[PDB]
Amino acid sequence: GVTVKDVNQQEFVRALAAFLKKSGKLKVPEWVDTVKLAKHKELAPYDENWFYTRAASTARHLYLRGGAGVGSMTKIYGGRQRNGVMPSHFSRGSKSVARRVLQALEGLKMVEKDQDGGRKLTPQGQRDLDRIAGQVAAAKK
Amino acid sequence: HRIRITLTSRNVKSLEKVCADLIRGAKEKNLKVKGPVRMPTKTLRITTRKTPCGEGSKTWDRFQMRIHKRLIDLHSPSEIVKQITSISIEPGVEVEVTIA
Amino acid sequence: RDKLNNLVLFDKATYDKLCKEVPNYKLITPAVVSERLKIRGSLARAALQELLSKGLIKLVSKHRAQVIYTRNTKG
Amino acid sequence: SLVIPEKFQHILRVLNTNIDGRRKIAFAITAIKGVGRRYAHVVLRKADIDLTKRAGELTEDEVERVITIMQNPRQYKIPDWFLNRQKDVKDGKYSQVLANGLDNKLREDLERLKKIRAHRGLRHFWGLRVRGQHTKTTGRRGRT
Amino acid sequence: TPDIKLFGKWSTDDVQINDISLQDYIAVKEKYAKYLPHSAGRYAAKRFRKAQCPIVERLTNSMMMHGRNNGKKLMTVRIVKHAFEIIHLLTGENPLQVLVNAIINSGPREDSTRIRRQAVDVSPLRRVNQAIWLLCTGAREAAFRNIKTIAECLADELINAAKGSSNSYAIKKKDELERVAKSNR
Amino acid sequence: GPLQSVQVFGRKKTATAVAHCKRGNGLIKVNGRPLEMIEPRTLQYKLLEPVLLLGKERFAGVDIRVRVKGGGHVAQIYAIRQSISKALVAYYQKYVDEASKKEIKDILIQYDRTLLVADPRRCESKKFGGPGARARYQKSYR
Amino acid sequence: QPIKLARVTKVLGRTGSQGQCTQVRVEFMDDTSRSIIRNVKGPVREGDVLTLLESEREARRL
RNA sequence: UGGCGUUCAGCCACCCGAGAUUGAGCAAUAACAGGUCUGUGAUGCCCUUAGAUGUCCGGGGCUGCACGCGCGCUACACUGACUGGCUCAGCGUGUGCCUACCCUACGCCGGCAGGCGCGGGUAACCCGUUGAACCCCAUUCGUGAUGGGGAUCGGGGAUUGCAAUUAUUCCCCAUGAACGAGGAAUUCCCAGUAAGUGCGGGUCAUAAGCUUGCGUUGAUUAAGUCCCUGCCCUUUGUACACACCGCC
Ligand SMILES: [Mg+2]
Ligand SMILES: [Mg+2]
Ligand SMILES: [Mg+2]
Ligand SMILES: [Mg+2]
Ligand SMILES: [Mg+2]
Ligand SMILES: [Mg+2]
Ligand SMILES: [Mg+2]
Ligand SMILES: [Mg+2]
Ligand SMILES: [Zn+2]
């Protein structure tokens, strides 16, 4: 019996990234190159497609827990600011880089916000999100 | 026939004596009752200085106040309860009564 | 104290010593080779990525801070 | 291919400024006064160039382009929220200030603030404290 | 598998204690071996309950020092773990024999004190606590402001203490500790 | 119709690891996911000393489901080792003989007492006029 | 000057100006006659083994 | 249970067991010329009392700076900074008397600071199962102050308010400065303890480099002494008794 939960959830996004690259209907926005992703990071992303990774991480936080992740996506993707005075508080994520993403993942059909807020997923996309996991499982020993 | 009677107070033993009074007279008058459900207690914290002035080694007092809360649900009519919430009530105790 | 002027890329012959003698060391790590060859620590990682698929170094561990390459096969 | 090809300089005379020829290009530009770490990766991004190369593997007819981008960072779509000269007082245009202009306009702006006998700026003539700090203990880097 | 105990792919036996003085106060054997060098602690509430902690655990607990290391034991196990790999592939021996040799060759036998000073000898537990503190400090200074991992420092310092090549703050502070108490003994 | 539900708890600091034991195959899973993708991967064999000390035949016939609440990253490991140890002994207690329990208890105890005895240690408060629980502030004269 | 070993048979006290050293009656394991009183640093329990660089001088019992 | 001791009070060791010293609160007779009239509509005497030392409205200062000391913060880097990913907390508060000032989910507009609409909650009922931090796995990286370090002092955007100039706080201009592990001297400290590390409250329209609490990562050494600085009893000596800061 195979699912996402026996796959050592680190390269599951290193093949779900390449699958949302290869299919390539994600509506990358216009301003991709020139953002900080936070108010605590200091540089741009090193990887040239930093948008697909975050779409795969979101698509698994969404597979795992919840139909109510909107600002809890910024509560899960913040970090550590550095004010030059004292260790700073866990700073929030970015509102636009995730509102634009979930509106861009509404372009295909895997997400569906219904009630009690937030975006939840569909069994039809759960088919795809579950079949490549047994692929990685048998292909990694 | 859905009536909840909340007993909240500071005095633990006298609040226990009223919640067991208000259950033993229900049980001795034949109406089904739930248990004496105990909610967790809340505390207060005040930390001040033990000095009017600023002189002396820096020493601080402290102050607390605990509070408890119980609630009891019944299955009864809503007229004899004015008598029931009157038999040996004790000072300090703040009884709430909800019929809705 | 001395200053260190290392090399970014091989001039002509320090590569001609690396392809002659590095594959005959028992301890091939980038902080040992760089003490021998006078090279920067951002180059030894590219040299042992070449000899990985060139197949002469017998990779052992791969922790991000330290790699361990032994000798080759006995014979 | 880990050996030195031709054309591999060690000092790139760029903009009356000597650029090292061994650092990564994302940290080779910062010798220009004004442009630092963030704006460099963008200039080395709007042209589809690798930034995992050394200063000397990039051709001489190709660094006329990253340079033209850094001189004119408008026609190549850089937004209005990067420029360290937004809404100038004298003309009122948006642009970038490079290695010369960043000291030039800076010491013409402090002369402008100085001439009017203004307390914000009549403190550089004294050489003392303004951004709103107290002193009482915090200089003492000499000072008689 | 009756009781084989990898220390991350090593073996507990084939360990030979040379001296008679350090016989029971050094526990690196059958009963005193665990697949990993970590425990819940509680080994200092009594006085001589420390002499039953394995020397692997006491190296781990005494590796982390100076501020930016207080509270990282799960991290400092990994240095030891790569350190025995490097020793196995540079000397080609059992490194738990190498380490017991380095403790022996690194322990002092006397020390000077104040009664102008006069000299006495040392206890075996003193000799363990001293040889460990010594060679661990000498590995750290040689890895401070140096392109060398602390594992490769501990590897060569354990080698030049089971070799005596005068490349060791561990042996080097032994002569200064002995010759001072020798002039005045 | 077997209802052999063996619910065992275990504590470290604030690590309320609850094991569970049914009858069936021999497999272990925690929060659903198996033992591999558990936390620090430097701490792998701390789930195998309940296996490797005894053996892998001792876990034939018992299947395991594990709840976890509270605690940090390490205490959620030292509470999920003691839990399934106390659930093995408590399964041989209630459903099979009490006598073959004593060898398993002896072998687990002759390795470490933590397998069966919780740690009666927690953190400690902060008195007034100090930056900690014992350390006082910098006192300066003159 | 050969290097010898000895054996504790009796602890005596804590001597020094600070109370930082011990005082222990040790025998010798080669010659069961020799037995001297010395002073030893560190934690010492009875019935244990010591080592002597010199084995001629002797402590001052007090 | 053994060991030790007048076979008295007790000490060490051991088994059995979740524990064989957990942590604070309260606290003596007698006394000090300790501090507070700037907490009080607790108060004696003295000055002023209508050109007011009472009271209100406009400003500006208490934040100034050749030097000196005391409490603290970030640091001086590879056990290390930078991008991803991964996965775990416990104490709390929260819509007001005069009182206008709550914690906030969830939908959109924007780089970001935020805004515009919308709903819940007087609270184990919602915010929230409070996806808290280094630590964890894959990424780039100096012997020179380097991507370490990020300060006096330089261009632009939003919020609280009747008002921010001497810049109220946070993102977007920079100088990218001193600092290569610290002298004589000196503080604190023995087990979930030192240290690292983030959260809550208090103060609060605006608000944490202080403080009061909580958690999490978790050590090295010691089971001893009177040498130093001090205290406690018995004996001793005295020309001191406002008492060695003495008297002469
Ligand atoms: Mg900083
Ligand atoms: Mg966080
Ligand atoms: Mg070190
Ligand atoms: Mg008086
Ligand atoms: Mg008065
Ligand atoms: Mg000072
Ligand atoms: Mg510096
Ligand atoms: Mg002292
Ligand atoms: Zn008053």
CA of C41: how far to CAs of C66, D59, E150, in Å?
11, 26, 16
b/e per residue F73-111 (b: at least 16 CB within 10 A): ebbbbbbbbbbbbbbbbbbbeeeeeeeebeebbeebeee
| Cα F129 to Cα G27: distance, rounded to the nearest angstrom | 54
Cross-chain residue pair E74–F74, CB shorter than 8 Å:
yes
- Beta strands F27-30 and G49-52 are unpaired
Q: Which residue of D has its CA nearest to A30?
A: D77
CA atoms within 13 A on the CB side of B69: 7
A88: the nucleotide nearest its CA (via C1') is H198
b/e per residue G8-28 (b: at least 16 CB within 10 A): beeeeeebbeeeebbbbbbbb
Q: Does domain D2-79 have CATH number 1.10.620.20?
A: no
Encoded amino acid at D135, one letter: T
* Ramachandran angles phi, psi of D19, nearest 5°: -100, 135
Task: Supply angle C-alpha C64, C66, C67, rounded to 5.
Answer: 100
Encoded amino acid at A3, one letter: T
Q: Which residues of C touch D28 (CB under 8 A)?
A: none
Experimental method of this PDB entry: cryo-EM
- Rounded to an integer, what is the distance from CA F118 to the centroid of its chain? 9
Q: Measuring CA to CA, which residue among G32, G6, G1 is closest to residue E121?
A: G6
To which residue do tokens 């360990």 refer? E15
Encoded amino acid at A49, one letter: N
| Cα E111 to Cα E182: distance, rounded to the nearest angstrom | 9
Q: Which residue of F has its CA nearest to A9?
A: F37
| Cα B71 to Cα B35: distance, rounded to the nearest angstrom | 9
Residues B98 and B12 sit within 8 Å (Cβ to Cβ): no
Chosen for mutation from A34, A42, A50, A85 (greatest number of chain D CBs closer than 10 Å) is A34
Query: Which SS3 state, helix, strand or coil, does residue F61 take?
Result: coil
As ranges, strand H nucleotides with an atom below 7 A of a protein CB are 18-19, 23-24, 26, 34-36, 39, 63-74, 77-80, 82-93, 105-114, 124, 128-129, 131-144, 147, 150-157, 165-176, 187-201, 208-227
Encoded amino acid at B54, one letter: G
b/e per residue F3-23 (b: at least 16 CB within 10 A): eeebebebbbbebbbbbbbbe
Q: Which of the 37-66 residues on chain D come under 7 Å of nucleic strand H at their beta carbon?
A: 37
Helix axes A50-64, A13-22, angle to 10 degrees: 120
Give residue E70 CA to ligand 6 midpoint distance, Å: 27
- DSSP code at position B33: B
Residues F35 and F28 sit within 8 Å (Cβ to Cβ): yes
Residue F30, number of CB atoms within 10 A of its CB: 21
> Is B48 in the F-facing interface, judged by CB distances under 8 Å?
no
Q: Which of the 2-31 residues on chain A come under 7 Å of nucleic strand H at their beta carbon?
A: 9-10, 13, 31
Give C57's contacts (C-beta < 8 A, 6+ positions apart).
C23, C28, C48, C51, C69, C70, C72
Long-range CB contacts (within 8 A, 24+) of D99-104 = D99/D15, D99/D16, D99/D17, D99/D32, D99/D33, D99/D34, D100/D33, D101/D34, D102/D33, D102/D34, D103/D33
* Ramachandran angles phi, psi of E130, nearest 5°: -85, -40
Residues B71 and B58 sit within 8 Å (Cβ to Cβ): no
| Cα D139 to Cα D137: distance, rounded to the nearest angstrom | 6
Chosen for mutation from E7, E12, E38 (greatest number of chain F CBs closer than 10 Å) is E38
Encoded amino acid at B99, one letter: I
Q: Please provide the distance, in angstroms rounded to a whole number, between the alpha carbons at the two ends of chain B.
A: 9
b/e per residue F41-70 (b: at least 16 CB within 10 A): eebebbbebbebbbeeebbeebebbbebee
Residue A133, number of CB atoms within 10 A of its CB: 19
Cross-chain residue pair C68–E89, CB shorter than 8 Å:
yes
| Cα D84 to Cα D96: distance, rounded to the nearest angstrom | 6
Give F96's contacts (C-beta < 8 A, 6+ positions apart).
none
| Cα E77 to Cα E81: distance, rounded to the nearest angstrom | 6
Q: Distance (Å) from the C-alpha of residue C4 to the closest C-alpha of chain D?
A: 14
CA of A124: how far to CAs of A95, A103, F27, in Å?
28, 18, 31
The residue ranges of every structural domain in chain D are 2-79, 80-144
Here the tokens at position D32 are: 């220009």
| Cα E98 to Cα E160: distance, rounded to the nearest angstrom | 10
Give residue B53 CA to ligand 5 midpoint distance, Å: 17
